[PDB]
Design a protein around this motif. Structure first.
Motif, PDB file in Angstrom:
ATOM      1  N   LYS A   1       0.825  -1.200   0.000  1.00  0.00           N
ATOM      2  CA  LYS A   1       0.000   0.000   0.000  1.00  0.00           C
ATOM      3  C   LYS A   1       0.863   1.255   0.000  1.00  0.00           C
ATOM      4  O   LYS A   1       0.557   2.226  -0.705  1.00  0.00           O
ATOM      5  N   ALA A   2       1.945   1.254   0.781  1.00  0.00           N
ATOM      6  CA  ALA A   2       2.924   2.343   0.808  1.00  0.00           C
ATOM      7  C   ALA A   2       2.280   3.692   1.107  1.00  0.00           C
ATOM      8  O   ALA A   2       2.751   4.732   0.641  1.00  0.00           O
ATOM      9  N   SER A   3       1.205   3.691   1.884  1.00  0.00           N
ATOM     10  CA  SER A   3       0.536   4.926   2.236  1.00  0.00           C
ATOM     11  C   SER A   3       1.153   5.533   3.489  1.00  0.00           C
ATOM     12  O   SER A   3       1.798   4.838   4.278  1.00  0.00           O
ATOM     13  N   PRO A   4       0.989   6.843   3.691  1.00  0.00           N
ATOM     14  CA  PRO A   4       1.372   7.423   4.985  1.00  0.00           C
ATOM     15  C   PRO A   4       0.615   6.796   6.139  1.00  0.00           C
ATOM     16  O   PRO A   4       1.185   6.606   7.226  1.00  0.00           O
ATOM     17  N   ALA A   5      -0.660   6.467   5.926  1.00  0.00           N
ATOM     18  CA  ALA A   5      -1.402   5.691   6.909  1.00  0.00           C
ATOM     19  C   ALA A   5      -0.721   4.359   7.186  1.00  0.00           C
ATOM     20  O   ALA A   5      -0.726   3.887   8.327  1.00  0.00           O
TER      21      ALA A   5
ATOM     22  N   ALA B   1       2.087   5.082   9.565  1.00  0.00           N
ATOM     23  CA  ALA B   1       1.561   5.289  10.910  1.00  0.00           C
ATOM     24  C   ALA B   1       1.144   3.971  11.548  1.00  0.00           C
ATOM     25  O   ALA B   1       1.359   3.755  12.744  1.00  0.00           O
ATOM     26  N   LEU B   2       0.555   3.072  10.758  1.00  0.00           N
ATOM     27  CA  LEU B   2       0.150   1.776  11.287  1.00  0.00           C
ATOM     28  C   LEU B   2       1.357   0.927  11.657  1.00  0.00           C
ATOM     29  O   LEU B   2       1.329   0.197  12.655  1.00  0.00           O
ATOM     30  N   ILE B   3       2.429   1.009  10.863  1.00  0.00           N
ATOM     31  CA  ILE B   3       3.650   0.289  11.197  1.00  0.00           C
ATOM     32  C   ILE B   3       4.249   0.838  12.481  1.00  0.00           C
ATOM     33  O   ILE B   3       4.745   0.074  13.321  1.00  0.00           O
ATOM     34  N   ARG B   4       4.218   2.160  12.660  1.00  0.00           N
ATOM     35  CA  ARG B   4       4.677   2.738  13.917  1.00  0.00           C
ATOM     36  C   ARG B   4       3.820   2.271  15.083  1.00  0.00           C
ATOM     37  O   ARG B   4       4.339   1.960  16.161  1.00  0.00           O
ATOM     38  N   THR B   5       2.503   2.196  14.878  1.00  0.00           N
ATOM     39  CA  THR B   5       1.608   1.716  15.924  1.00  0.00           C
ATOM     40  C   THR B   5       1.930   0.278  16.305  1.00  0.00           C
ATOM     41  O   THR B   5       1.975  -0.071  17.491  1.00  0.00           O
TER      42      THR B   5
ATOM     43  N   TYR C   1       9.746   4.435  -0.418  1.00  0.00           N
ATOM     44  CA  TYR C   1       9.038   4.683   0.832  1.00  0.00           C
ATOM     45  C   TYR C   1       9.665   3.899   1.975  1.00  0.00           C
ATOM     46  O   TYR C   1       9.927   4.447   3.050  1.00  0.00           O
ATOM     47  N   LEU C   2       9.927   2.612   1.750  1.00  0.00           N
ATOM     48  CA  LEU C   2      10.520   1.776   2.784  1.00  0.00           C
ATOM     49  C   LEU C   2      11.940   2.212   3.110  1.00  0.00           C
ATOM     50  O   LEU C   2      12.345   2.164   4.275  1.00  0.00           O
ATOM     51  N   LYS C   3      12.707   2.637   2.106  1.00  0.00           N
ATOM     52  CA  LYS C   3      14.050   3.143   2.371  1.00  0.00           C
ATOM     53  C   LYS C   3      13.994   4.361   3.282  1.00  0.00           C
ATOM     54  O   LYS C   3      14.735   4.450   4.270  1.00  0.00           O
ATOM     55  N   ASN C   4      13.099   5.303   2.975  1.00  0.00           N
ATOM     56  CA  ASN C   4      12.976   6.494   3.808  1.00  0.00           C
ATOM     57  C   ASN C   4      12.481   6.145   5.208  1.00  0.00           C
ATOM     58  O   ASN C   4      12.937   6.728   6.198  1.00  0.00           O
ATOM     59  N   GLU C   5      11.551   5.193   5.308  1.00  0.00           N
ATOM     60  CA  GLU C   5      11.015   4.821   6.614  1.00  0.00           C
ATOM     61  C   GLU C   5      12.066   4.131   7.472  1.00  0.00           C
ATOM     62  O   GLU C   5      12.137   4.362   8.685  1.00  0.00           O
ATOM     63  N   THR C   6      12.895   3.280   6.862  1.00  0.00           N
ATOM     64  CA  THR C   6      13.928   2.582   7.618  1.00  0.00           C
ATOM     65  C   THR C   6      15.163   3.454   7.793  1.00  0.00           C
ATOM     66  O   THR C   6      16.102   3.072   8.503  1.00  0.00           O
TER      67      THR C   6
END
Length: 268
Positions: A26-30, A33-37, A76-81
Motif C-alpha cells: 500500500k505504501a501509504s502514509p497511513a 503510521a500503522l507500522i509505527r503503531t 518509501y521503505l528506504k525512507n522509513e527505515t
C-alpha cells in the motif's frame, strides 16, 4: 479474539510476517503510521521491524506489484527505515532469494523479474544467466526449502506451494546445477517424501523431475537411494511411480549396469 490467539501481540507477531508486505504494497502514509503503531505495541522501532520483515516484504512485492509501484514502495521503505534500500537488500543476501524461490511456483515470471532485480542489486533476464547467478546460493536455498518443509509453522498448503516452487526451481537450474546439487536435492526430496502423506502425486512429480530431468550418466550411485525412497510412493499409488521406475531402469539401463543388480529390494 475471533481467532483466539494467546497474546494479541503474539497474534501481531504471527500476522506481521505477511501484513508488513501488504502494508508496504500500500505504501501509504497511513501504512507508515500503522507500522509505527504496531512497533509500539510490539515495543520495537518502526525502522528495524521493516528491515527484519523486508524478506517477506520484497517477496510479496515481487510476487504482486507493479514496477512503478514497486519503486514507489521501495523508496518509501528506504525512507522509513532511514537506510538505503540497496544496502538493506545487501544485508538480506540470501533470505530474500529464499522467499523468491519459494514463490516461483506461484509466479515464475514475476520471480524471474525479482531475481533480475536481485542480481542488479547483487552486482539480467537470460534464463542461463539467472541460473548462473543463482547457482551459488543453491545449497543454502535447498536448505531453506528443506527447513520450510520441516517447519510446523507453515501449513500443508504452504508445503505444497514450496514443493511446486522446488519443482520449478529444479527445472530452472538446468542439468549442470541439478547434477552439482544432487545430494542436497535428494535430501530435500526425502523431506518431501516425509511430508508426502497428503500430496503424493506432487512429490511423485518432484521425483519424476529429479530422475528424468536429472543427469543421465551419474544415475546409479543415486538410483540406490532413489529406489529406497520411492518404495513408499509405489504403495500409495503406482500410476506415476511406475513410469518413474521405468525411466530409471529402462531408459538409463546402460548407465545402470551394476547399480541395477545392486538394487535387490523391489515391490510388486
Amino acid at each position: 479474539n475471533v481467532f483466539d490467539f494467546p497474546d494479541l501481540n503474539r497474534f501481531l507477531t504471527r500476522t506481521l510476517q505477511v501484513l508488513l508486505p501488504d502494508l508496504a504494497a500500500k505504501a501509504s502514509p497511513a501504512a507508515s503510521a500503522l507500522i509505527r503503531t504496531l512497533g509500539k505495541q510490539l515495543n520495537v522501532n518502526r525502522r528495524e521491524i521493516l528491515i527484519n520483515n523486508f524478506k517477506y516484504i520484497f517477496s510479496h512485492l515481487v510476487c504482486s506489484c507493479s514496477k512503478d509501484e514497486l519503486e514507489r514502495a521501495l523508496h518509501y521503505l528506504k525512507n522509513e527505515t532511514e537506510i538505503e534500500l540497496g544496502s538493506l537488500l545487501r544485508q538480506d543476501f540470501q533470505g530474500l532469494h529464499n522467499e523468491l524461490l519459494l514463490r516461483i511456483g506461484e509466479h515464475y515470471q514475476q520471480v524471474f523479474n525479482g531475481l533480475s532485480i536481485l542480481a542488479s542489486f547483487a552486482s539480467i533476464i537470460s534464463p542461463e544467466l539467472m541460473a548462473d547467478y543463482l547457482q551459488p546460493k543453491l545449497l543454502g536455498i535447498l536448505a531453506f526449502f528443506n527447513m520450510q518443509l520441516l517447519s510446523s509453522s507453515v501449513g500443508i498448503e504452504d508445503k505444497k506451494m514450496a514443493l511446486n516452487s522446488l519443482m520449478s526451481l529444479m527445472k530452472l537450474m538446468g542439468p549442470k546445477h541439478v547434477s552439482s546439487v544432487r545430494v542436497k536435492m535428494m535430501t530435500t526430496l526425502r523431506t518431501g517424501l516425509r511430508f508426502k502423506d497428503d500430496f503424493p502425486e506432487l512429490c511423485c512429480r518432484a521425483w519424476d523431475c529429479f530422475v528424468r530431468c536429472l543427469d543421465h550418466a551419474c544415475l546409479g550411485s543415486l538410483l540406490s537411494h532413489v529406489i529406497v525412497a520411492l518404495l513408499p510412493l509405489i504403495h500409495i499409488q503406482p500410476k506415476e511411480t511406475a513410469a518413474i521406475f521405468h525411466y530409471l531402469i529402462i531408459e538409463n539401463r546402460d548407465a545402470v549396469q551394476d547399480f541395477l543388480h545392486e538394487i535387490y529390494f523391489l515391490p510388486d
